[PDB]
Design a protein around this nucleic acid. Structure first.
Lengths: 558, 50, 797
RNA sequence: UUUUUUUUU
């Protein structure tokens, strides 16, 4: 920063000077200058890090230099330029004067020309960074080959010398470089995806945006999160992407997944609070407007609105239970501030998801994940001494426990019980029960609370009884031996790194076994070689074995 | 003009004394021997003085 | 009107008038009706340098002189604010104002002339009624009345009013009715040029020079005399010029001694060496002072081409009909030749030709005239050699090769000798004592070495004694003429300058003539060798580089600057261009090709080839050896009186020189070019004084002007714009040709200095600024800490 | 509102 401060101020002057309205060449040469020197600094940092031997102390390795460099590159050059662009379109589009719209149209055309130029420059900068780090170094052992092909690195010919082929294993933390390249790729994908979503905002004249326009950004953020799962800041950006298009349940799942990661994202916490604490926040009024719009469509619309009921009515239940003050009327605690009764809305959910679980199970799964994370973020909310036993729980969290276990027992009785046997292809049906039991076993206090809850216990007993009676496989039985797989399932990935399962689903004792045998990194991300790809049927039997084993282990002391 | 007449006579006799050809550009081109040369007519006229 | 009144406006106020020392006249300081004050106007128009203030003025009756050294050239002096309050010390610009002294801070030193005007404190401005009472005079009348002080010293505004004849010289025509009209149109300009060149050179008599005598290797007395640096720099002398060194005084009777110059002042010595011709009267070696040197003007340059014009206008057998009627520009049907084409155009054991040069060689052997246009670095030299060799083998005749530049003729002759042909070099009689790389091809050397019989004894006697008897001299000249005729008749090709074709020794008519870089010479200089009975003329030259420098201004206006190559191209002749370059980096090549060559030029070298690895020079963009280091200094006037110089650009260029030296580049790979001469001089002494590292490592660097650095190349070249004035007047850099010839000097890296604001007005420099800025090279500040410069380059419409 | 170079019996 001691060397980069002047250019930060130099960029600041240029925006304040407003010279870029006439002379884009100034901006282009300025960008060339900063690209040149930031690339030089990155190269110097990498070459200095590489020169150190393995015998050097880990404390002497400065891993945060390149991360700071690239964060400065986005937030201090690229993001401020995009902000100036944004204010500039705001000014011309929202010019309240009565000037002819044709002039605004030509100004808009100049917008597209210049911002395609600038976005092309920025994308060239990032893609050149990616290609260079792919060229001078070997990343096959550390990155999945899917990321290599999806980034189109395969067509990039590798010029590394044989003596330059670094001998670093898959997950050797002793080698420093096992982390800087993952962070570099993760943040490059992050900023490239932000560039694509921003450009999508730029190109559209109107403020109305559809999901179909942010496909590439969603992909890039997907590989971004795959590159490094232990970065909640990646999930928050996707949460914002789903935020502005009006998909809110997936959004809130994104923000919670972001904040309870090993490294929590403050922006995700601020966003969740805006949707959930600040009654004055416009996003909370967006939630209220769309929820009673959904109520109006349910009451008067020709058809039962299944999907958005299942999502936003659930958001209403989650609000009304999680933060009672801001939603339930002070006069009438049994109804929302919009006047919608809680019991009607809850029963509407029960009927709606019991009727249309199969078409919207993913939304229901996100409902499960938000419900289970809610208790943790609630006990984290405590400014007093944190809870350790059931006795320390206050009335609000006991009520939340009752509603959450009501939901769990209901849907276990109504969806998994009837749809597990008919639908082997739907892995979420059994992955949900795996999540429920893994989460109940990862935290002792919910486990103790579960044994006192009759609904959940009887639902689990009934599910075990149906699974046993149907006899899915001839050798299926209740055994204490933990089943092992050669890889991880989709629930393992989509619930990886989250503390309420202690950052990994432990229903299978095969993590080390997966590590010791080849393609371990690829198999850890659910993409093994085609030889070991078992059928979805075998997947359902293995999930059944794990579910019945853990459920019996839970019900032994019910 | 007398110069024009000299030009026309010189061009006509150059046309007569050579063989005809067509160039790559399409302009009519006369091929003539190196060892045979033609000196253009001069005439008389007044000369400037220092 | 009082004697103290201004000679131009008649203001009587002694707070504004100032006395000229040379002509004993008084001058004002106002800018009424002129862009400058009158005093400097008269100083530059009449060459005057010394001025004296009025007795009644605040300073008194004093003559402006330098404190430290005593120079009286007002263009040098300037005030320095002494550390003691209200104390003014007079110091010249150099070296007094740059040699640091603790009694005053020299960083605030300001020239006595600012904005073409003297300081108010030295000479105050006239009051408004004094301005309105003074008669108005426009610069036209200023120059007209100044023009006649050199004849009469009593001329005033009403005195002259002279309708001297200024006959409108006929402008040059494209297609003449006959040879007579061509000669009539050309003659007068040449007469004027000869007359005024003789006038300027004869006015350079060197008087009371201190001459040191020495003996040369050939037993010839050397007259080495030192002159002032200003006079030596103003001396437009080449090696081998002849003058008269005569002394008249009591110490020794009248003597006359003629000889040539074998040495010229350079960065090491400022001594003019005169090798005297052996004479019966011995030179007075015991004398050292009182000698006077008068240059012997020679009209042989003009009289020869006058004879050439006579031959063109008279002799029928002077030029073949086709080339005659093409030189006159008349319409004639195209003519080819019956020549068998060679099997392979390229010559074994020599350079291999590409497609473009193959086309050039192929299309040239079939037509009597054609024009070849060559961008710099392409290597026209090999094409010329191949064409000459193949034509000679085809026809087996004597071939003539001519070029305006002596060094160019030397290069072409060495190359032709490299092809195995028989080459004879015709050296000028004054230049017979001048060494060259092709000295073994000299015709005088050939007759001296191939001398046999009586010829050896005559040559030895002439060398030993110096003078021979009349009969012996006549036998000698007759026999050397015989030997020269035998040599030329035996020689395959003949080498002589474009002016050397007027020599009587070339009596034999020549049929095959090569004219090289014709544009560099004027039209008569290329018509000298074309009227000697040739049937095939081939003209090589490029019309996008510097051409003829015509001292006459009416001649240059009428068209004497238009060379034969340019006239033929204007006629309708389409040249054959070579579209590949082998010298400069593609980044260095993108602009000039795009602007001057329509972008058609292509790069025959790759980026890696023109890239120096592990270069520690802080270029604005890594990988792009080009930057624009802006400087906001102010231009001044050097000791000449018409040039300009800039000290800020000098210190910055010295800094860049040191920086490139710490990068490992040898001095021979780096040169400095300045469009103004006084700037070059100031750079020279500033480098030799303020060299941060060893001064030798700086003096080995070659520095010269743009025009004196044409046809050469260097690894690194620094361009200095110099011009930095408030009026945004650039001057003579408005022509794109000067910019074109400057950039292509550098092979690897290009550095440009100057003030971008003054240059921004010019459209050509505006586009240069655009191209430099858009590539992220427009910077400012210190070279170590360069940031981008954000001056508005596009004018708001 | 122009200052630079080529050539020379």
């Amino acid at each position: 920063p001691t060397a980069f401060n002047g250019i930060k101020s130099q960029l600041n002057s240029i925006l304040k000077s407003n010279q870029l309205f006439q002379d884009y060449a100034l901006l282009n040469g300025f960008l060339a200058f900063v690209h040149s020197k930031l690339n030089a600094a990155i190269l110097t940092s990498i070459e200095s890090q590489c020169g150190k031997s393995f015998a050097a102390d880990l404390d002497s390795f400065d891993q945060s230099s390149i991360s700071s460099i690239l964060d400065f590159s986005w937030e201090s050059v690229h993001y401020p330029i995009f902000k100036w662009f944004q204010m500039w379109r705001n000014y011309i589009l929202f010019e309240k004067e009565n000037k002819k719209q044709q002039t605004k149209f030509i100004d808009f055309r100049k917008m597209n020309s210049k911002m395609l130029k600038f976005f092309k420059t920025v994308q060239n900068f990032y893609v050149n960074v990616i290609n260079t780090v792919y060229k001078k170094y070997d990343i096959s052992v550390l990155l999945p080959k899917r990321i290599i092909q999806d980034l189109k690195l395969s067509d990039i010919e590798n010029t590394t010398n044989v003596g330059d082929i670094l001998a670093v294993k898959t997950f050797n933390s002793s080698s420093p470089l096992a982390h800087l390249i993952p962070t570099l790729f993760h943040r490059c994908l992050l900023f490239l995806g932000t560039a694509y979503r921003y450009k999508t905002l730029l190109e559209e004249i109107s403020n109305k945006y559809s999901i179909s326009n942010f496909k590439k950004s969603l992909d890039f953020f997907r590989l971004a999160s795959l590159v490094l799962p232990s970065a909640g800041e990646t999930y928050s950006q996707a949460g914002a992407i789903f935020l502005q298009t009006g998909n809110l349940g997936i959004a809130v799942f994104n923000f919670v997944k972001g904040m309870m990661t090993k490294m929590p994202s403050p922006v995700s916490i601020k966003n969740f609070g805006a949707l959930m604490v600040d009654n004055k926040s416009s996003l909370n009024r967006s939630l209220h407007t769309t929820i009673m719009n959904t109520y109006l469509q349910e009451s008067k619309g020709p058809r039962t609105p299944a999907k958005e009921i299942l999502e936003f009515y659930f958001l209403g239940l989650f609000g009304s239970v999680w933060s009672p003050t801001s939603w339930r009327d002070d006069t009438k605690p049994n109804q929302l501030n919009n006047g919608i009764k809680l019991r009607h809305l809850e029963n509407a959910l029960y009927e709606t998801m019991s009727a249309r679980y199969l078409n919207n199970i993913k939304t229901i799964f996100h409902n499960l994940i938000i419900t289970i994370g809610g208790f943790h973020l609630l006990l984290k909310r405590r400014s007093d001494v944190s809870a350790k036993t059931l006795k320390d729980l206050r009335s609000n969290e006991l009520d939340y426990l009752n509603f959450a276990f009501k939901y769990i027992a209901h849907i276990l009785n109504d969806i998994v019980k009837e749809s597990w046997s008919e639908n082997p292809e739907v892995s979420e049906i059994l992955g949900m029960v795996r999540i429920i039991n893994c989460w109940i076993k990862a935290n002792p206090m919910v486990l103790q609370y579960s044994q006192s809850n009759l609904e959940f216990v009887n639902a689990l007993a009934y599910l075990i009884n149906d699974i046993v009676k149907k006899k899915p496989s001839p050798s299926f039985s209740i055994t204490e031996h933990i089943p092992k797989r050669t890889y991880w399932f989709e629930e393992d990935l989509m619930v990886k790194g989250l503390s309420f399962v202690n950052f990994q689903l432990s229903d299978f004792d095969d993590y080390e076994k997966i590590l010791e045998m080849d393609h371990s990194l690829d198999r850890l991300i659910g993409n093994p070689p085609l030889c070991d790809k078992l059928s979805a049927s075998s997947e359902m039997l293995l999930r059944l074995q794990a579910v019945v084993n853990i459920s019996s282990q839970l019900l032994q002391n019910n | 003009d007398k110069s024009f007449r000299e030009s026309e006579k010189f061009n006509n006799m150059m046309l007569k004394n050579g063989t005809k050809e067509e160039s790559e550009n399409g302009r009519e081109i006369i091929r003539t021997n190196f060892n045979k040369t033609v000196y253009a007519s001069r005439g008389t006229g007044e000369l400037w003085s220092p | 009107a009082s004697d103290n009144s201004c000679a131009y406006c008649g203001i009587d106020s002694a707070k504004c008038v100032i006395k000229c020392n040379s002509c004993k006249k008084w001058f004002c300081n106002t800018k009424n009706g002129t862009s400058s004050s009158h005093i400097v106007n008269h100083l530059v128009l009449s060459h005057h340098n010394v001025v004296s203030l009025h007795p009644d003025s605040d300073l008194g009756d004093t003559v402006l002189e330098c404190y430290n050294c005593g120079r009286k050239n007002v263009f040098l002096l300037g005030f320095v604010s002494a550390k003691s309050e209200a104390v003014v010390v007079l110091l010249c610009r150099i070296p007094c104002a740059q040699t640091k002294n603790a009694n005053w801070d020299t960083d605030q030193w300001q020239p006595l002339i600012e904005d073409r005007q003297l300081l108010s404190w030295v000479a105050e401005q006239p009051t408004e009624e004094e301005k309105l009472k003074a008669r108005l005079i426009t610069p036209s009348q200023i120059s007209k009345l100044e023009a006649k002080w050199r004849s009469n010293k009593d001329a005033t505004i009403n005195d002259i009013d002279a309708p001297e004849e200024q006959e409108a010289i006929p402008p040059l025509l494209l297609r003449y009715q006959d040879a007579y009209e061509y000669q009539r149109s050309y003659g007068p300009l040449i007469k004027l040029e000869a007359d005024y060149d003789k006038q300027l050179k004869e006015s350079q008599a060197l008087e009371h020079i201190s001459v040191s005598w020495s003996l040369a290797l050939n037993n010839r007395h050397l007259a080495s005399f030192t002159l002032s640096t200003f006079e030596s720099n103003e001396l437009k002398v080449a090696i081998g010029d002849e003058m008269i060194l005569w002394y008249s005084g009591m110490q020794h009777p009248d003597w006359e001694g003629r000889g040539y110059i074998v040495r010229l002042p350079n960065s090491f010595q400022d001594t003019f060496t005169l090798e005297l011709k052996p004479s019966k009267t011995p030179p007075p070696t015991h004398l050292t002072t009182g000698f006077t040197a008068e240059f012997i003007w020679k009209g042989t340059s003009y009289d020869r081409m006058q004879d050439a014009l006579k031959k063109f206008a008279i002799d029928k057998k002077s030029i073949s009909g086709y080339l005659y009627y093409k030189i006159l520009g008349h319409q004639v049907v195209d003519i080819s030749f019956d020549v068998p084409l060679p099997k392979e155009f390229s010559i074994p054991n020599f350079a291999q030709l590409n497609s473009s040069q193959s086309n050039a060689v192929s299309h040239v052997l079939q037509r009597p005239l054609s024009l070849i246009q060559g961008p710099p670095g392409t290597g026209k030299t090999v094409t010329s050699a191949t064409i000459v060799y193949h034509l000679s083998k085809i026809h087996k005749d004597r071939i003539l090769v001519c070029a305006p530049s002596n060094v160019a003729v030397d290069h072409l002759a060495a190359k032709l000798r490299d092809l195995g042909l028989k080459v004879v070099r015709l050296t000028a009689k004054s230049r017979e004592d001048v060494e060259s790389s092709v000295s073994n091809l000299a015709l005088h050397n050939l007759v001296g070495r191939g001398a046999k019989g009586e010829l050896k004894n005559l040559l030895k006697l002439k060398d030993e004694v110096g003078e021979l008897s009349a009969s012996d001299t006549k036998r000698f000249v007759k026999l050397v003429r015989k030997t020269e005729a035998e040599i030329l008749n035996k020689a395959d090709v003949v080498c002589c300058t474009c002016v050397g074709a007027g020599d009587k020794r070339l009596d034999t008519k020549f049929r095959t003539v090569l004219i090289d870089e014709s544009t560099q010479a004027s039209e008569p200089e290329c018509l000298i060798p074309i009227v000697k009975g040739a049937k095939q003329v081939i003209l090589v030259g490029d019309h996008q580089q510097l051409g003829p420098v015509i001292l006459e201004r009416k001649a240059a206006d009428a068209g004497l600057k238009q060379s034969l190559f340019e006239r033929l191209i204007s006629l309708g002749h389409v040249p054959i261009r070579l579209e590949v370059q082998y010298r400069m980096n593609p980044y260095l090549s993108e602009f000039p090709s795009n602007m001057f060559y329509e972008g058609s030029l292509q790069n025959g070298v790759t980026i890696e080839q023109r890239t120096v690895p592990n270069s520690k020079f802080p270029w604005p963009i890594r990988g792009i050896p080009m930057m624009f280091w802006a400087n906001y200094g102010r231009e001044e006037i050097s000791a000449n009186g018409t040039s300009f110089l800039n000290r800020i650009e000098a210190m910055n260029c010295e800094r860049i020189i040191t920086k490139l030296f710490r990068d490992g580049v040898k001095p021979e790979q780096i040169g400095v070019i300045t469009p103004y001469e006084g700037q070059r001089a100031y750079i020279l002494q500033y480098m030799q004084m303020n060299g941060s590292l060893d001064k030798d490592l700086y003096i080995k660097v070659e520095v010269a002007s743009v025009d004196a650095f044409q046809g050469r190349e260097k690894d690194y070249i620094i361009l200095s714009c110099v011009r930095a004035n408030e009026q945004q007047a650039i001057g003579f850099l408005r022509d794109p040709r000067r910019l074109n010839v400057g950039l292509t000097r550098a092979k690897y890296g290009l550095v440009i200095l100057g003030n971008p604001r003054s240059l921004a007005r010019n459209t050509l420099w505006n586009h240069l600024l655009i191209h430099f800025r858009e590539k992220g090279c427009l910077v400012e500040g210190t070279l170590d800490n360069l940031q981008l410069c954000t001056v508005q380059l596009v004018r708001p419409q």
